[PDB]
Amino acid sequence: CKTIDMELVKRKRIEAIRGQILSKLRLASPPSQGEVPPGPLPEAVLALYNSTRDRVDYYAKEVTRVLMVETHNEIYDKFKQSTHSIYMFFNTSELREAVPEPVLLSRAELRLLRLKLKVEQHVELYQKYSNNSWRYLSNRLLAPSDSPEWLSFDVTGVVRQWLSRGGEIEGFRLSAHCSCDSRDNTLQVDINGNRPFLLLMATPLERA
Amino acid sequence: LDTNYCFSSTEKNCCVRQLYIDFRKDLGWKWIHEPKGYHANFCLGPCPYIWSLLALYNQHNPGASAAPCCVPQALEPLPIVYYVGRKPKVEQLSNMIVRSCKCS
Amino acid sequence: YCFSSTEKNCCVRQLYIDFRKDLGWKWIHEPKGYHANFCLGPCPYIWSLDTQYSKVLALYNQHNPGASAAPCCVPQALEPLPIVYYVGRKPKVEQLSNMIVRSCKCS
Amino acid sequence: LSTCKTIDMELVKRKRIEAIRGQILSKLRLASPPSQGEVPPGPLPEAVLALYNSTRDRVDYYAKEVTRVLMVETHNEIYDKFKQSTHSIYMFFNTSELREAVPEPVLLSRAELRLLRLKLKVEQHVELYQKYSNNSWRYLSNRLLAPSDSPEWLSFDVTGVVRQWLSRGGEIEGFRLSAHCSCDSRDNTLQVDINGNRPFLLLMATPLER
Amino acid sequence: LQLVESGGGLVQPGGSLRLSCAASGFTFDDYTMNWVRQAPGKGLEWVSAIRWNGVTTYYAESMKGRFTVSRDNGQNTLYLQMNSLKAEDTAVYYCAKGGSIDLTYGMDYWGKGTLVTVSS
Amino acid sequence: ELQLVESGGGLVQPGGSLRLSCAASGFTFDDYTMNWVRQAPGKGLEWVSAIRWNGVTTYYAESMKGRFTVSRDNGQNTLYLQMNSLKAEDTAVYYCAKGGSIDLTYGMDYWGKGTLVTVSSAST
Amino acid sequence: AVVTQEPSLSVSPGGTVTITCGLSSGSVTRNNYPDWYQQTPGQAPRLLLYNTVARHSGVPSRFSGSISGNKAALTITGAQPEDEAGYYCALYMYTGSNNGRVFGGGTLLTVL
Amino acid sequence: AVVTQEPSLSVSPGGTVTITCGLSSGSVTRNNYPDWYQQTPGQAPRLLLYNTVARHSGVPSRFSGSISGNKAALTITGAQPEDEAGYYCALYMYTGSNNGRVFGGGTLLTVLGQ
Amino acid sequence: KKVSCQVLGLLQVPSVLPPDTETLDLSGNQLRSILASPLGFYTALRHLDLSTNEISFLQPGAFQALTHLEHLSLAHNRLAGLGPLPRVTSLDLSGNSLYSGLLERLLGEAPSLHTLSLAENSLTRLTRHTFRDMPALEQLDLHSNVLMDIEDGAFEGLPRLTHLNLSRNSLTCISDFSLQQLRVLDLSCNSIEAFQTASQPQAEFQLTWLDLRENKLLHFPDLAALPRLIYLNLSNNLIRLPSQLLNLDLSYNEIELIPDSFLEHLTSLCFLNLSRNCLRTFEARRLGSLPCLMLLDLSHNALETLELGARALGSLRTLLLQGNALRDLPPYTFANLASLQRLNLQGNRVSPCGGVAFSGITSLRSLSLVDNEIELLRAGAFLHTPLTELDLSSNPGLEVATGALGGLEASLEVLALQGNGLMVLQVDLPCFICLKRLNLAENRLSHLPAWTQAVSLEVLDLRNNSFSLLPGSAMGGLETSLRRLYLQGNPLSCCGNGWLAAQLHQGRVD
Ligand SMILES: *[C@@H]1O[C@H](CO)[C@@H](O[C@@H]2O[C@H](CO)[C@@H](O[C@@H]3O[C@H](CO[C@H]4O[C@H](CO)[C@@H](O)[C@H](O)[C@@H]4O)[C@@H](O)[C@H](O)[C@@H]3O)[C@H](O)[C@H]2NC(C)=O)[C@H](O)[C@H]1NC(C)=O
Ligand SMILES: *[C@@H]1O[C@H](CO)[C@@H](O[C@@H]2O[C@H](CO)[C@@H](O[C@@H]3O[C@H](CO[C@H]4O[C@H](CO)[C@@H](O)[C@H](O)[C@@H]4O)[C@@H](O)[C@H](O)[C@@H]3O)[C@H](O)[C@H]2NC(C)=O)[C@H](O)[C@H]1NC(C)=O
Ligand SMILES: *[C@@H]1O[C@H](CO)[C@@H](O[C@@H]2O[C@H](CO)[C@@H](O)[C@H](O)[C@H]2NC(C)=O)[C@H](O)[C@H]1NC(C)=O
Ligand SMILES: *[C@@H]1O[C@H](CO)[C@@H](O)[C@H](O)[C@H]1NC(C)=O
Ligand SMILES: *[C@@H]1O[C@H](CO)[C@@H](O)[C@H](O)[C@H]1NC(C)=O
Ligand SMILES: *[C@@H]1O[C@H](CO)[C@@H](O)[C@H](O)[C@H]1NC(C)=O
Ligand SMILES: *[C@@H]1O[C@H](CO)[C@@H](O)[C@H](O)[C@H]1NC(C)=O
Ligand SMILES: *[C@@H]1O[C@H](CO)[C@@H](O)[C@H](O)[C@H]1NC(C)=O
């Protein structure tokens, strides 16, 4: 039968939420707002929060986004955006400035902005090796849509290896899926080949 | 049973009930700059034994807990933005928004 | 740690069920028994303060992770069990989902 | 005031015994346990033991019947058009047998394509496709097989396409397991599966009686 | 994607005839092939079928043995030689493209059909 | 296999010029950075220069910047270090080193035998 | 065996009608694959339904196939005057010596 | 900046030895990618370690690398007698007006064979 | 001798204050440390307050220099050391983040304290060595702590402890009680599922106050070893019921039946809340049961049948029975009872008799029959009942018979008929001289009885009615006793009567 009170459960949930927020942040006390800037939030932090809110352990993981190296950089002269593949290279020095130690990384997310698809497209993600080789990472069957969508790839192990065993420039190739019948081309359109980035959630060094 | 079934329709057993937490009014905080608040919700109501009677009982196990209550099954994360000293920080807390409940 | 100790936390406890002896059943042919296990250990609602010690956030960690109003010790990962039994004169293999408890959590 | 530290194990033990007894009788939709009087006391037949051994091995509330359907013999004339090559193997299933297995497409809940991989020396990437009527193939799944010195069973989640076979499907529809042929280099399936035992289809479905 | 058939006409009782079927727009190697007949003013009657290669055939019981179905995939042609044709075999015959390599998926496309009239 | 052979080393007067050449087989210059390193007799290694896969951008040591030039002929499958106006301290065994990747990172995998370049105003 | 349909029927335009196809010997299942064809007189038959459910390419969604009881059913919802035609059922069973298709006496569906 | 490296080390066979290379002005991070090379006197240098941890193909598993404190450390565990050589550390930094590698004065690691 | 520094905010302890000051209140400051040199200058201090601060360092000799220090308030500091306190009576350690393990080293010897407050801290275990050498404690405050476990001899170092507050804790199971000197216990807002006491004690306990509310108690605990208890809050728990108690709060439980033997020993209770439960049968068939219950709440339950005994429950004053599912009751169910005063039967569909009969009680004062679906009202419903408060609201389709209110003319004070939808009223309103407030909202009334004589009406409700014309020749009575008047929602014609506009200036409201 009905024997529970709404208000007591609500207030207990509120207090448990307070404890959960203070504990997941490993916060003994709420942060004092004495030394806050006297103005609104910067654009980079707002964009990071928007990307975290976007639709694609226990403690809080610090979130940092690292944009890919711009397509005008020398690195893409060797790897040109062919009809059947696009290349996305990242400066791993920026990744280490974001995540100082490989063990701290909790999840890494390669984020793409697909513009439009009249037909469904099967695409596949590879990572780059030093000897110009590519190892398979994933496969996604993009359904057609009339609106740009944010694509997500789980590359946690790849970025962890890059933080540990990676060079200055390390990247991915997104290519149209090929079979043993014939060859295909990449009909999906992403901005700048904004541009795709890496959303890294890692344990903060202060709470490591 | 997700939020779609119980946000519009009442139901006898337990499911997600609405709860919007505002950091100023409901909790009393000036340190969380974004968001102003969030829909945490909660799981509330009873769960009878299945032989005493659904999507609630998909992961049901009377032989695991002494008395079957019900707990959230889908727990969507929450990102927050807050200042430490003068440095903004965006942090992701997992299992913060209740989405679907299940008897266990 | 808590598989063979009576400590007060939400843990899975090993429990073997023998259909011939524990339940006295003579209709299930295989399996003769299985590790059903059970979740045991109180999950006390840890009341919250704005200012608190750093060694007590662990009590939040393994006493109220989901921040529920009335937490329970409930299974987190379960394993299904296949059984074989006869209906009339026809044998049947069925697969009962969520029978073997291998992890318990406060929720 | 003294918080208790001794937990009475026998009371909770009997409580869970009664709870699991009720749970077993609830998922099976049985008010009472069945009668063994109309059961020949025979060591269970080889087919049912094969069912149980296949569903034991790994890679809705109620209980669900498990049935295996063996993939059609390679000696049949169906495979004459689709010859087992060095880049693809074919596994065709007589959908009629799927329908004596699962009478209604709504009753089907889970379907797994089961293969028995032999000893593998190098890591092999395989792709699973579903046969269309007009000799075309839709991609279904990708599996990365790490090398091993032992034969292991491999499961492919094919529940949706098997439900489509039960509802809208033909008679001899099947799958193709090929090597991942990239856009730059051609590859071959050095993977060797037994009999092209042979692969089969494991179906966990709600019985029409319950 | 179209089918043209030929060979219909006047045949004496207990006669012989060879219908022919040629198609375009698809491949005979990929589909089974069916022969259907329809009596003038009466219902359809499935006559025969042949699979993708042509080594195994299927027949109706009322005309098995009297009808021989065959293929030739090189020039994409199809035959139904009717031997010991009786007086009850007058019908419009449709050569039909089936949906798959088996008798399932239906006769996906049908042809115009040729009239076979048996009389003295 | 994996082979770098070097040539051009010898004895010159101070302020002279050499054109050290490095021919490779077993790999492709189009995929790898190429480095020049030097080792003075009796002392440790010293990184001299590097050049990426195309050759449009080059890196130098600041004891050598401007004074040395590096170049590649991917068509000829060879690498050049042209040294001009050598001082007295420029005598060393020079090593041609393959790189691990297109970057200046992943280390210098395979090294050549090196050519012993001597600078001396003293006569025989 | 012999495939049985009703000899004929009529439906008002815009209504829902059910043409039904059975065996004299035993039931129909999805294993006895019902194919539903439409034939305007003077024209070759056109495939509507195959494998008890699936529509042929170009068939409007009005026609829906199912198994009703012991027989196979084609349901037309919202009939139109061009639907007046002969509807035929092809059942795949073991006919005599070999196994193949068999047709039934088609229903001359006449829209009122 | 110059890469400071300690001059010479002695390790008993089967022992554990650590070689550290550092910046005079700064701290060695993984962004200052350390490359560890081994040179037998009279032979070409061989890459042992790259990207602070990664072993070159053919290099024994007893060679490992890490960032210890503010320096880069190469650790040899169970020093075989054929490991007596000159060990050099090449750090990737921004010198002068461009990026480049800088070698430190390598350690003349001598194994006490007798 | 009193210096107030609550408004003043500083960073260190002031040294310019006069030493003779006895009471110092340094609340609202931002001090970080305490030093002996500034503190010992005020030897004449009697009371010291330093709450809401950030003090993190305490000198052991800082508090030793003040022999006359008392009411020590170290609240809200970063204390997460202290010497002996010879003459301090009151201690407060609220919000200082005391964890289980700091109190043993912090607290030395202090046998002369009365009140100790360890509230709002992070204490996890109350070890036997936590309390020692302090046999003078009488007030222990431990609320808002994180205690899960208490050993059997944890409180043995407090031989004279009487009041103990353990609210807002996580104490879960409690199996033994051995605190003889305890008077007040507050175990509220915990996760307690079982509460067991000692068996056959040498001496009877002295507990007189016990909260067991907001817990997970599955059963009514055995309090036969607590004879001095007078207040007992067991609300918001899960009691499923299988001598000197007075107040009992059994609200928000799963109580489905009341055992007879449980009613045998239950006596001398005065107040009782047992609302919002799922009871099935409640019969007081035992003679002499419930002798002095001054209040009994049975609201929001699911009782279908009740059989109250004759001359057993007679001293009851306030009774609520709303939400029950009663089907059939004898007409003399309440007639045999002695002195009921207030009776509530909302949502029970109780049909009055013509004379369940309500006229058989001459002591009834308030009765409410809201949402009882009374189609037609008896004439002798209140013929012999001197009721003063009547509530027949929310009764659509109700038909009022002539003379329905028999003897309420000189007794009724307030009447509510909201939502009844009466097309006509057969009750002569003006002759009810004792009436004070009237509710007639949401009705189809178009005419009212003529007020020939003034009455004592004060509140008149006329929402959602069909009153278009209100002439002053009939409604003009009670023009001097009216204080609040309401007229919104009526389709009154513009200047149709003129008396309402004239009386709106004085003696009426909007
Ligand atoms: C990947 O990202 C790296 C940083 O995230 C890039 O390194 C940067 O490289 C540029 C030139 O290529 C340098 O610009 C120079 O800066 C020096 C001063 O640098 C000094 O100060 C910085 C900051 O304190 C310190 O990190 C350096 O080590 C030096 O001590 C000036 O002389 C000029 O302005 C010149 O432009 C950056 O300083 C450098 N940032 C670093 C090292 O953090 C790297 O180039 C990126 N890789 C690719 C392929 O683009
Ligand atoms: C896919 O599986 C199907 C069933 O699992 C296979 O169907 C089998 O086809 C063979 C023909 O080679 C049949 O063998 C004959 O069976 C008849 C009895 O048929 C009965 O059923 C039909 C209706 O289907 C009915 O019309 C008849 O009157 C019978 O009542 C025997 O009389 C013959 O002697 C001969 O043995 C099988 O019986 C049939 N299986 C079943 C369960 O009916 C199908 O062939 C498989 N697909 C392929 C490509 O092989
Ligand atoms: C035991 O401590 C609790 C602390 O919560 C007291 O409850 C508070 O009492 C104050 C004043 O009496 C109220 O303003 C609060 O609203 C109460 N809070 C709660 C959660 O109840 C309680 O009164 C104390 N008990 C005794 C006997 O002193
Ligand atoms: C984030 O999204 C909001 C809309 O919800 C928009 O107003 C804001 O400008 C966005 N932030 C950035 C940095 O674009
Ligand atoms: C490239 O290097 C990777 C290192 O993991 C190796 O696995 C791969 O075989 C190499 N490829 C070639 C062509 O040498
Ligand atoms: C084959 O039929 C399928 C039906 O789903 C269709 O999607 C596909 O385009 C067809 N392919 C060809 C080559 O006709
Ligand atoms: C008993 O506790 C409840 C809270 O569960 C409270 O509402 C009630 O007022 C308490 N009883 C008394 C007499 O205060
Ligand atoms: C419980 O009864 C007391 C008796 O005076 C009353 O004050 C209190 O408000 C009641 N509480 C509830 C929740 O009924």
> Can you name the residues that pair with D65 across neighbouring β-strands?
C94, D205
With 0-12 CB in 10 A as exposed, 13-18 as middle and 19+ as buried, what is I278? middle
CA dist I455 and I459 (Å) reads 12
Confirm whether D11 is domain-assigned: no
CA C11 to chain centre: 8
Phi/psi region, residue C7 (left: phi>0; alpha: psi -120 to 50; beta: rest), is beta
Nearest alpha carbon, ligand 7 atom 1? I233
**Does residue C31 have a cis bond before it (omega within 30 degrees)?**
yes
> Can you name the residues that pair with G101 across neighbouring β-strands?
G92
For residue F109, which ligand has an atom nearest its CA?
A: 5
Across the beta sheet with A197-202, what order do the strands follow?
A: A149-154, A105-114, A197-202, A61-67, B87-103, B70-84, B32-34
CB of A142 sitting under 6 A from ligand 4:
no
What's the fold here for domain E2-118?
A: Immunoglobulin-like (2.60.40)
Confirm whether C4 is domain-assigned: no
CA dist I191 and I292 (Å) reads 33
Give CA separation, F41 vs E40, F89, I308, in Å.
108, 10, 115
Confirm whether H4 is domain-assigned: no
Which residues, in sequence order, are CB contacts of H88 under 8 Å at separation 6+?
A: F44, F45, H5, H36, H37, H38, H39, H45, H103, H104, H106
- Quickly list DSSP for A94-152: HHHHHSSSGGGEEEEEEEEEE--BSS-EEEEEEEE-TTS-EEEEEEEEE--BSS-EEEE
Q: Which residues of A fall within a CB distance of 8 Å from H29?
A: 96
Residue H103 at interface with chain A, using a CB cutoff of 8 Å? no
Alpha-carbon gap: D180 to the closest alpha carbon of chain A (Å) = 7
Confirm whether D85 is domain-assigned: yes
Q: How far is the CA of A95 from the centre of ligand 1 (A)?
A: 14
* Cβ-defined contacts of F3-8 (< 8 Å, 24+): F4/F96, F4/F97, F4/F98, F4/F110, F4/F111, F4/F112, F4/F113, F5/F112, F5/F113, F6/F94, F6/F95, F6/F96, F6/F112, F6/F113, F6/F114, F6/F115, F7/F115, F8/F115
DSSP H helices, chain B, are 3-8
Contact C98 B72 (CB under 8 A): no
DSSP H helices, I188-321, are 260-264
R_g of chain F computed on alpha carbons: 14
Q: Which of helix, strand or coil describes residue I257?
A: strand
Provide the token pair at F2: 């994996």
Q: Which residues of H fall within a CB distance of 8 Å from F61?
A: 95, 100
Closest atom of ligand 6 to CA, residue D134:
1
CATH of residue H86 = 2.60.40.10
CATH of residue B17 = 2.10.90.10
Q: Which residues of I fall within a CB distance of 8 Å from D3?
A: 148-151, 171-175
Closest CA to E115 of E33, E11, E45, E12: E11
Could you tell me whether strands G85-93 and G71-77 are parallel, antiparallel, or unpaired per DSSP bridges?
unpaired
Count of other CB atoms within 10 angstroms of residue A122: 15
**Cα dihedral I200/I206/I212/I217 (nearest 10):** 0
Interface of I with C (CB under 8 A): 80, 95, 97, 99, 120, 122, 124, 144, 146, 148-149, 168-173, 189-191, 193, 216
Q: Which of helix, strand or coil describes residue C69?
A: coil
Compare all CA atoms of chain I with the CA of D1 and give the residue at the minimum distance: I177
Cβ distance A75 to A167 under 8 Å?
no
| Total count of domains within chain D | 1
| Residues 65 through 84 of chain A touching chain D, CB cutoff 8 Å | 84
**DSSP code of D148?**
B
Q: How far is the CA of G93 from the centre of ligand 7 (A)?
A: 77
Closest CA to E16 of E53, E77, E66, E63: E66
Q: Which of helix, strand or coil describes residue D210?
A: coil
Confirm whether H6 is domain-assigned: no
> Can you name the residues that pair with H36 across neighbouring β-strands?
H49, H89
Please name the helix (run of DSSP H) or strand (run of DSSP E) that holds residue A47, with its range, or none.
helix A43-53
I373-404 burial by CB neighbour count: b if 16+ within 10 A, else e?
ebeebbbbbbbebbbbbbbbbbbeebebeeeb
CA dist H38 and H65 (Å) reads 14
Of D96, D167, D168, the CB nearest to G31: D96
| Residues 161 through 190 of chain A touching chain D, CB cutoff 8 Å | 175-180, 183-184
Q: Which of helix, strand or coil describes residue B5?
A: helix
F101 backbone dihedrals φ, ψ, rounded to 5°: -160, -175
| Total count of domains within chain I | 1
Range of the domain at G60: 3-111
Of D125, D183, D186, the CB nearest to A136: D125
Please name the helix (run of DSSP H) or strand (run of DSSP E) that holds residue B90, with its range, or none.
strand B87-103
Compare all CA atoms of chain F with the CA of H99 and give the residue at the minimum distance: F59
For residue G33, which ligand has an atom nearest its CA?
A: 2
**Cα dihedral D33/D34/D39/D45 (nearest 10):** -70
Contact A9 C69 (CB under 8 A): yes
Range of the domain at A46: 42-202
Report the greatest alpha carbon distance in chain D: 83
**DSSP code of I381?**
T
Q: Tokens 């490993």 — which residue?
A: A26
Q: How far is the CA of I293 from the centre of ligand 8 (A)?
A: 14
Nearest alpha carbon, ligand 3 atom 28? I165
Chain gaps in chain B, named by the residue before each (C–N > 2.5 Å): 53
Of E61, E104, E108, the CB nearest to G92: E104
Closest atom of ligand 7 to CA, residue I251:
5
Which residues, in sequence order, are CB contacts of I229 under 8 Å at separation 6+?
A: I207, I208, I209, I210, I223, I244, I245
Of A3, A5, A28, the CB nearest to I278: A3
Closest CA to I234 of I201, I198, I265, I190: I190
Compare all CA atoms of chain B with the CA of C14 and give the residue at the minimum distance: B64
CB of A132 sitting under 6 A from ligand 5:
no
Could you tell me whether strands I459-461 and G35-39 are parallel, antiparallel, or unpaired per DSSP bridges?
unpaired
Closest CA to D68 of D50, D43, D86: D50
CA H47 to chain centre: 10
CA F54 to chain centre: 16
Residue whose CB lies within 8 A of the most ligand 2 atoms, among G94, G98, G102, for a mutation test: G94
Compare all CA atoms of chain A with the CA of H67 and give the residue at the minimum distance: A101
Confirm whether H65 is domain-assigned: yes
Domain ranges of chain E: 2-118
Residue C44 at interface with chain A, using a CB cutoff of 8 Å? no
SS (H, E, C) I63-101: CCCCCCCEEEECCCCCCCCCCCCCCCCEEECCCCCCECC
Count of other CB atoms within 10 angstroms of residue D190: 11
Cβ distance I189 to I161 under 8 Å?
no
CATH of residue I427 = 3.80.10.10
Which residues, in sequence order, are CB contacts of I42 under 8 Å at separation 6+?
A: I17, I19, I21, I24, I66
CB of D132 sitting under 6 A from ligand 6:
yes
- Quickly list DSSP for H10-48: EE-TT-EEEEEEEESSS---TTS-EEEEEE-TTS--EEE
Q: Which of helix, strand or coil describes residue A9?
A: helix
Of A136, A141, A175, the CB nearest to D183: A175
CA dist H98 and A92 (Å) reads 19
With 0-12 CB in 10 A as exposed, 13-18 as middle and 19+ as buried, what is I454? middle
Cβ distance I295 to I316 under 8 Å?
yes
Cβ distance I456 to I479 under 8 Å?
no
Contact A178 D181 (CB under 8 A): yes
Contact D2 I194 (CB under 8 A): no
Count of other CB atoms within 10 angstroms of residue G66: 13
Cβ distance H52 to H33 under 8 Å?
yes
CA I79 to chain centre: 37
Closest CA to E64 of E52, E44, E49: E49
Overall resolution, Å: 3.0
Method used to solve the structure: cryo-EM
D39 backbone dihedrals φ, ψ, rounded to 5°: -115, 120
Confirm whether C98 is domain-assigned: yes
Cβ distance A47 to A169 under 8 Å?
no
| Total count of domains within chain H | 1
Cβ distance C17 to C32 under 8 Å?
no
**DSSP code of E53?**
S
The single-letter code of the amino acid at I408 is L
Count of other CB atoms within 10 angstroms of residue I32: 14
CA dist F108 and F46 (Å) reads 13
Confirm whether C101 is domain-assigned: yes
Confirm whether I252 is domain-assigned: no
Closest atom of ligand 7 to CA, residue I252:
5
∠ CA I71-I75-I77 to the nearest 5 degrees? 140
Closest CA to I272 of I298, I291, I294, I296: I296
Q: Tokens 């690292």 — which residue?
A: A66
> Can you name the residues that pair with H34 across neighbouring β-strands?
H91
Closest CA to I235 of I290, I273, I194, I187: I273
What's the CATH class of domain F3-118? mainly beta
For residue I277, which ligand has an atom nearest its CA?
A: 8
**Does residue D147 have a cis bond before it (omega within 30 degrees)?**
no
Range of the domain at I369: 349-510
